[PDB]
Every structure is written in structure tokens, then in C-alpha cells.
From a paper:
In our initial selection, AT206 interacted with unliganded detergent-purified AT1R; however, this interaction was not detected in cells, likely due to a reduced affinity for the on-cell receptor. Given the direct interactions between AT206 and losartan, we suspected that CDR3 would be substantially remodeled within the empty orthosteric pocket and recognize distinct features of AT1R. To visualize this state, we solved an additional structure of the unliganded AT206–AT1R complex to 2.9 Å global resolution. AT206 shares the same overall binding mode for unliganded and losartan-bound AT1R, with CDR3 forming β-stranded interactions with ECL2 and looping down into the orthosteric pocket. CDR3 binds deeper within the orthosteric pocket in the unliganded structure compared to the losartan-bound AT206–AT1R complex structure. I104CDR3 and V105CDR3 occupy the losartan binding site and replace some of the interactions that occur between the small molecule and receptor. Similar to the biphenol core of losartan, I104CDR3 and V105CDR3 form hydrophobic interactions with W842.60. In addition, the backbone carbonyl of V105CDR3 coordinates R1674.64, which forms key interactions with many small-molecule AT1R antagonists.
Here, we sought to develop a more universal approach to identify nanobody ligands for GPCRs. The two nanobodies characterized in this study, AT206 and AT209, share a binding mode with other GPCR nanobody ligands and allosteric modulators, with an extended CDR3 sitting in or above the orthosteric pocket.
Numbering used by the authors:
A (entry chain C): 4 to 125
B (entry chain A): 30 to 133, 141 to 272, 280 to 341, 1235 to 1271, 1277 to 1306
C (entry chain B): 29 to 39, 43 to 51, 55 to 66, 79 to 85, 91 to 117
D (entry chain D): 2 to 110
The structure:
Amino acid sequence: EVQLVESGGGLVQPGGSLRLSCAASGFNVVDFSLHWVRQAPGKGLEWVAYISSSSGSTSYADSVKGRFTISADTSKNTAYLQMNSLRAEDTAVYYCARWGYWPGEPWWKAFDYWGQGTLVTV
Amino acid sequence: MIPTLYSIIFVVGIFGNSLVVIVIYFYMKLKTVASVFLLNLALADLCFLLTLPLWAVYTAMEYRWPFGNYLCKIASASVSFNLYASVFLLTCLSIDRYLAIVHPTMLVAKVTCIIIWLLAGLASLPAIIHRNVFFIENTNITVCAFHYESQNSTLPIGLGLTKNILGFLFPFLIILTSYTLIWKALKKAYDLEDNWETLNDNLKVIEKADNAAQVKDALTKMRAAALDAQKATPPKSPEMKDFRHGFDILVGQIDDALKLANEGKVKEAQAAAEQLKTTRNAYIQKYLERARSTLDKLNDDIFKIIMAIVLFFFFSWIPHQIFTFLDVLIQLGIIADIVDTAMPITICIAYFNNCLNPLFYGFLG
Amino acid sequence: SYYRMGWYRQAEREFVAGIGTTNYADSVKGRFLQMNSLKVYYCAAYNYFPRSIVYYYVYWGQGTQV
Amino acid sequence: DIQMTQSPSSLSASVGDRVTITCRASQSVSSAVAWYQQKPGKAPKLLIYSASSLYSGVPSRFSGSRSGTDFTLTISSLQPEDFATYYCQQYLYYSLVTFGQGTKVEIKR
């Protein structure tokens, strides 16, 4: 029953802001790190951002650094990605992957459960 | 040249092995098991070289034996005894090296040596009970002939099979097993050592760093190295609950340093790297020093001497063993001139090793 | 196999008959079944020359007194 | 910045054939290389979580292997459900995740 669903994707004007939400069911977000991975249409997967809710540490990809803000609420086990100053390259399908915590086998199962992914276009 | 090549072997072999037996007994006394086994090996080679000039002078006169029956029996038994004693002592040397390297015993060594000499004497019993002088037809040619009667039929087949199997197959297999296990242990120790050397180098380049980009790159290399080192578990759950736990803590500290360095805080990255240096001593230093000690045994001269002796012995004896197999195939009817043509060549080169076994001591010492 | 054959006396192993030549002793003893008017013989299977210093075999056996 | 490169950009094979995808990292990443399968129009699914450790629930036909910096995904009994795209992800650290270019299995004709 463990899964991650995405919401908030849709058609928005270029240069605007987006709020992509990732709802987690069957596990606690505090025990996992939630990563956002983009995939351009007809192209491979690209890692965008991540948040470690317990530690609070977040990171971003160099292409999206300084434009995105990833946060998380542990009460509802949800993650949020806030996009500002959207561009043409940001038109892609975003997936909310879940990655465990060091040490142990949870860490070695990288992105075991992905999200459904939402398409955003400019 | 076979009659004269033997003369060369006796000159070098007696001079070499007599120095070797003194060195392993006086200059470097019997302080280790391998010293006892090398002393016994030198004694066996001396025992064979004592009877070698008999074969040399017998081949000098176009294969005719001037001595009595007892000299013929002694020489043949000495050939067989040298083969078996050498192979058994070499296998015991390989087993001792495997135990020393992988599992870090004098009375047992002496018992093993006397048992080896007893077994080699027992295996040379057919040659010391059947060999006898034999006048060749109406001429005066007398040779050291093997007389196997109807009761003991197919005895030469059995002796050839024993030489090829007990004297070459089991020793080769046991030595290959011991040395491949040794190489496995060396590979694990070298993996651990190399990974920790890369970790130390990247730690040092972290210490002398200016911006966070170099710190991030060095921490990346350190994390990869630590993950690789955690895989290289020492050969032979008290250990796994401590080796893996130590490396889990290490990579956790690397992750803390990476978290601090990504934010742009260089000084906290340096501090976390120093805490990693502290953690090395608590959990990983014992296995590091164990791996270093295991790798130290390769630069040991005695390991190189033993490996060179084993390799050269088997290279020298391969032609004689395969030609004995061909000859027993011919005798058994399964299968010719070339087999007999190079038989003296094989018997000469097989026992040529006793000539230059001391030379290894003079090159790898 | 294919060894040189022979016959020896044990009145010792005194060489009598040697065949593949016919180098007999100082007695006639027929030729290659001996002389039946004579006043244990061993069949020896030995190679002509030693292949090596060690390789030289003799089969003997076939003890048959006349 | 560790870059993953896949040699077989396009792969075509028939049912029951054996295929192999090779992925090379810009530097040593230990056994931190996962293999994912993505069907067209669907989210990727993890197949191999270590370099050579099979994820639970996936068919046993998939295998992985590590040789230094060469990571190989091997499929032996190619059933008709293996015609999707395959990605190698170096996941050495959370902020160091890099996926490969991709490799799609097509029907050989």
C-alpha cells in the first residue's frame, strides 16, 4: 500500500510559479528522503532536487539551483516543490522518488518507490 | 653432454647446498617452520647429489655400470627419494605459508620432516628391492636394470602412475589451492589498503583546501572509497558487527561533512573530516594494521624464495612427468621414438633444479 | 612391449640364448626346441640399450626347467 | 559531478534472447549503481538496487554485475514484457544522483 502521488501539475504561463505536491502513503516521510526527478518529453531522467525531512537539509541540481524551493510537512507526510521563474526547459514530467537513510539496505535501495509524476508545460 | 652436464650440477649443487644448509642452521638458525622445511629440502638435495656422480660416470661410458649392485640400488632409490621428498617438503612449505599469511609449531615441524623422510623412503622401496645389475647379452655391458617378474607384473606402470599422480598431481593441486587462497587474502588486504590510502589522500587534500568545490570533490572520492573498503571484509558475528559498523559510522561522518560542505560552510567540513580521522582509530585501525601486516609478508624474502623454488621445481619436473605418462601409455598399450629420445633429457633437466636451488637464496636473499 | 627376448640358465643367470641377433653361449642349444640330446630357463625381455640412466627393465619369469 | 554513459543507445532483440547493457561512470562510485526499467507513459521501477543485487518482486531473469567502473545489466529470457527503457543511476550521495542516457529494448525484425 506504500506509494507516492503527485499533484499540482498543469498548464501554466512561462515565468510563473508552480507548487508541486507529493503525498506519501504507507510510510513516514521522516524516515525517508524525498527527491524530485524531472524527465523531459522524449528524453532521459534528470535529478532536480531533494529534501531530507529529518535533517532538514535540501539540495538542488545546478540547472535548477536558485530557482526552486523544496520543503516538507511531516504532519501529513507530504513534500512540496516551489518553482519560480519557469523556463522552456522546465517543461517535463516530475516524479517524487523515495530514498532511504544510511546505514543499511534502505539506503542501497535507491528510489525503490517512485511517484506517478505530473506533467508541467510552459 | 648429459654425462658432462651432470658434472656441472655436482660442482654447483654440492657447493651451493652446503653453504645453504649452513646458513639455515647457523647464520639464520631454525627459528621458523619454513626454515626447518628449507633445511630438510637442502639435505634431500644433498642426498641426491651424493649419488648423482654415479649416474654421471655411468652415462659417461655409454651406459655401462662399473659399480656393484648396491650402488645401482642406492642410485635409483635416491632418484625416487629425491622426487618424493622434494614434493612433500614443498607442499608442507606451501601449507605453512598459507597458515602464516591467512591464519596468523616446531616439534610438529620436526615430526612432519621425519614423517616425510619415512614416506619418501617407503616410496623408494621398489627401486631398492628390484634394481639389480644385469650383464647385457654376451658383451660385458652391465647396467642398473629393473627386474620385475611375473608375480609383480605391471609394476612399472604402477610406479609411473604413482610418480605422475602422488608425486605431481596431488602436490600441484595442494600448492595451487594454498597459493590461490593466499592470493585471495592478499587481494582483500590490498583492496582495504588501497581504499584507505585514497581516503587518506582525499582527507589531506580536504585539509589544505580553499573553496567548497574541492572539498565536495574530495568528500565524494572519500565516500566512494569508504563504501568500497566496507565491501572488502577481511578473510575470516563479532567481526561483521564491528567491521561493517565502523565503516557505517565512517560513511555517516562523510555524509555529515558533505551536508556541511554543500551549504558552503568549509570550516565545518574540515571539522567533520577531522572527526572522521578520529573515528579511524576507534574501529578501522586494527583491520588496517592487520591488512598491512598481511601485505608485509610479500616483501619477506622467504616467501619469494619458497614461491620461486616451487615454481621452478614444477617447471623442471613437468617434462619428466608428462614423458613418464607417455611411456606408461605406451607400455599399457593405449599408444614413440621421441618419448625415448628425450627421456634422458627429461631426467637430466628434472634434477637440474638441485643445481640452482641455492642460487635463489643468493638472488632473493 | 617389443622387447628383446632371451633365455638364461640357473645352474647365476648364465646367458644362453639371445634373439630379437643369435649370440648364443659356448653351446649349440639349437637355434631360434633346444638340443634334446643335452647331458631352469628364464625368458628375459630386456631393451637393447637403456633409454635413460634409470629406465631399463627386465621381465624374467617363465621358469621352466628342462 | 559523476557522469554515467550507456553504450547501447538503441537495442533490438527477439523473445527469449539475451541482452546486455553496459554503463560506465566518470569515476569510482562503489557498488552505488541502480538499474531502473521505465515503460512508456509510466513511472520507472527499480530492478537492481546495488550494482549486482536484484530488487524484491522483479523477475529473477535480470542480473547485474560490477567490474571496476563497468556496470552490466543482463537479461537472459527476454519475455515480451521487457520492451521498455533502461536507466543506470549512480546514487553515491543524495545530491550526486546521475542517471544514464537510456537504452530501450525493441522487437527485432
